[PDB]
Each structure stands twice: as structure tokens, then as C-alpha cells.
Swiss-Prot record, chains A, B:
Lineage of source species: Eukaryota, Metazoa, Chordata, Craniata, Vertebrata
Domain C-type lectin, first and last residues per copy: 12-126
UniProt-reported outcome of changing residue 101 to A: Impairs binding to acetylated LDL (AcLDL)
Protein name: Oxidized low-density lipoprotein receptor 1
Induction: By inflammatory cytokines such as TNF, IFNG/IFN-gamma, IL6/interleukin-6 and by pathological conditions such as hyperlipidemia, hypertension and diabetes mellitus. Up-regulated in atherosclerotic lesions, by oxLDL, reactive oxygen species and fluid shear stress, suggesting that it may participate in amplification of oxLDL-induced vascular dysfunction.
Residues of the full protein shown: 143 to 273 of 273
Site (Not glycosylated): 44
UniProt remark on domains: The cytoplasmic region is required for subcellular sorting on the cell surface. The C-type lectin domain mediates the recognition and binding of oxLDL.
Tissues/organs with expression: Expressed at high level in endothelial cells and vascular-rich organs such as placenta, lung, liver and brain, aortic intima, bone marrow, spinal cord and substantia nigra. Also expressed at the surface of dendritic cells. Widely expressed at intermediate and low level.
PTM comment: The intrachain disulfide-bonds prevent N-glycosylation at some sites.
Species per Swiss-Prot/TrEMBL record: Homo sapiens (Human)
Pathology linked to this chain's protein: Independent association genetic studies have implicated OLR1 gene variants in myocardial infarction susceptibility.
Residue spans, topological domain Extracellular: 4-134
Amino acid sequence: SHMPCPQDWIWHGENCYLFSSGSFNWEKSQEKCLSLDAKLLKINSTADLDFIQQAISYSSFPFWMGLSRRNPSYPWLWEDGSPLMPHLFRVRGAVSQTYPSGTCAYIQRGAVYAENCILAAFSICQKKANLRAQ
Amino acid sequence: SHMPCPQDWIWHGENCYLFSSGSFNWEKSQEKCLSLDAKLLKINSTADLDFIQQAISYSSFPFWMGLSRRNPSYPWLWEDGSPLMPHLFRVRGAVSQTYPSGTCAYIQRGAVYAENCILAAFSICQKKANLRAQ
Ligand code: NI
Ligand code: NI
């Protein structure tokens, strides 16, 4: 109970969050989080969204999250294959197009945008905190 | 409740860091940090500066730190009354003006600027981490 999260991460709720250092395309951002035994940000509730919007209010830049879609006939899914809960947010940006490497979502000034996954952006990683979960 | 830092703060070393939610004058920024049992950022060492430069790499905004003086007849001091270590950074900007409410310093894009304290910036709060349970 004394060390929920490592240094340089942010503890919130049952998880730890990391501003990853690099600016990379979505696939490389995914690999970076996985290399840390973590995953790209998964917004699971309105409380999570509120937390992230507050946590990024010091920055105007985009941050990749773990949401992607091969083309518009597929659902938006998190990396674990679960869907975007429809009450959380409405993806803006490049929602009609199809790109060779897929479309991915980032958050920027609290709003969520679709973009060609080849864009280099910052990303947020998360992992479970070292505590006894409910 | 004996972990290093509260939820939402970044734990680094001996300290916990919090980015402000918005842009305010130095006095209001100082009071926010005090309300959190914290102070505005103090940069003690090159290692602290390296950490801060990385932490603000995600932003183009200015961030007040706890460095101020009333006019050029005074030394630059942190809120705790201790002096600035001069090797850390050049203080750019308005160093030699006398302003009615003093001159204060912010960091922006890794560079430190003196500015009239009544103008607004984001800010970084700092407080000592609780490490005895580690
Ligand atoms: Ni513990
Ligand atoms: Ni505790």
C-alpha cells in the first residue's frame, strides 16, 4: 500500500499513468507501452476522461490513446479488443477516410480526434497500480 | 496514505510535482500551491532542471517557478528564502525592471524568463515526497 506507482508515473485510482518520452507513430507508441509492461491509455469511464483532461491541460499537443480502427466498417476498439463505450466521447477528425496503416485516436485539448496512424505524436501509457484492487 | 505522493502528482526523487490546471498570476499560483501543502517549483540542482525540462517537453506554455525578487537591489530567492544557484540557467527577459508587485521567473521551452509577477502563466507545484515507508 506504500508504493502504488513507480517514479515518474502518475497514480490515479487503480492505475498508474505515464507520459511516454517519445513522439512516434501509433504502432511504435503501442510497442513502447508494451515494453514497459503497460498499454496505451484506455479511457474506461467519465471519471477517467475527466482525469486525463485535467492531467493534459498543461499541453496543447496530441497524445495517442489505445483506440484504433482499421477502416470505417470496423468498430473503434481498444487494444484489448473492447469497444469504446458510447457515452464517453465522440471521435472527431479523420473519421471518413481509410489509410494504409489504419486510423488511430489521440486526445488534444481534451477532445478526441481520428488521424492516420503514421502521425508522430506523444502518447500516454497505463498499467495497474501495486495495490489491493477492490 | 503513507505512499510518496498523492494521486495525480508525478513522483520524482524526493519530491512530488503537479502541473496547474490553468494560467494565473504569480500570487494566485503561489496560493494554489500552498493550498495543496506545497510550494511553487524550486530547482536545486542540474538533475532537477533535467527532470523539469523533460516534464515540460510536452508543452509550449510558460510555467511559473518559486523564484522572485522585488527589484534588482535584491537577490533572486526561492520561496523558502534560499538563493538561486547561478549555474543552473540564465535568467532571460526583464531582469532589470522595477515592477509594482515584483519580478518572478517562469520556464518555457526549457528557458527561464523574468517577468512582471502580475502577468499570467501556468505553474508547477512541488512538495516533499513521503519516503519513510519505502
Ligand atoms: Ni505498500
Ligand atoms: Ni499509506
